[PDB]
Amino acid sequence: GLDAVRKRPGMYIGDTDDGTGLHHMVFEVVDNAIDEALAGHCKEIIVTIHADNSVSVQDDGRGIPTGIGVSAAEVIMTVLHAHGVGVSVVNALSQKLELVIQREGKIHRQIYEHGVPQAPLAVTGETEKTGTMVRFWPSLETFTNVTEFEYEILAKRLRELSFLNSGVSIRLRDKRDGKEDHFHYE
Numbered sequence: 001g002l003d004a005v006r007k008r009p010g011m012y013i014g015d016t017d018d019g020t021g022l023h024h025m026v027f028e029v030v031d032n033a034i035d036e037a038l039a040g041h042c043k044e045i046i047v048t049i050h051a052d053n054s055v056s057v058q059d060d061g062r063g064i065p066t067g068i069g070v071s072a073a074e075v076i077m078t079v080l081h082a083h084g085v086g087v088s089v090v091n092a093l094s095q096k097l098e099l100v101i102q103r104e105g106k107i108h109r110q111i112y113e114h115g116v117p118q119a120p121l122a123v124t125g126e127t128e129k130t131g132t133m134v135r136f137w138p139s140l141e142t143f144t145n146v147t148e149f150e151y152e153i154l155a156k157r158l159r160e161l162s163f164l165n166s167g168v169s170i171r172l173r174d175k176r177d178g179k180e181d182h183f184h185y186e
């Protein structure tokens, strides 16, 4: 797993030099979010392009199962297959990834670096909401040439996903210039 995806990134995520793979990192995370909506638990997904060239995806689904050794969420984030290659591949190809889960009345947080957790999933507070939030900074040792996220590419796929999932609200936000969109087609 981990190490092997790192050694041959292209085979799993696509062209690492023309931007195809870069944007598909985002799509893989969104697809995971889409599932929680297809399951009948998620109603709105928010995708954000931060000014430090990172992307975050948040939803209001159940939240990735926590609790145990390692929590079920850590297994999902670090074990290959524990088009959809998983967040585990996205995590291994990110120089930094931030994971936040709201489930069973608690706020859980964890940081990853090139797929390795700096520490175990920790509880940092109470909450009465549920949902998952993943924010990742693409590894510049893997991705070359096109290294910055393009809004139009994201907007194009997010719209098609909206039409194929009538009912789920999808919002796109660019913090680099204030652009924003809301897809909710019929």
Ligand SMILES: CO[C@@H]1[C@@H](OC(=O)c2ccc(C)[nH]2)[C@@H](O)[C@H](Oc2ccc3c(O)c(NC(=O)c4ccc(O)c(CC=C(C)C)c4)c(=O)oc3c2Cl)OC1(C)C
Residues within 6 Å of the ligand: 029, 031, 032, 033, 035, 036, 057, 058, 059, 061, 062, 063, 064, 065, 066, 072, 073, 076, 087, 132, 133, 134
């Ligand atoms: C990357 O994660 C994805 C999710 O991505 C996301 O939700 C996601 C990623 C990024 C963003 C913003 N959203 C989403 O694809 C999808 O979600 C599921 C898919 C199935 C279940 C499920 O059967 C439940 N039933 C339980 O009783 C339960 C309780 C304890 C427990 O140990 C397990 C087994 C553990 C796992 C991980 C299935 C199940 C439940 O409670 O929750 C689930 C969730 Cl949250 O699959 C993941 C593998 C967990």
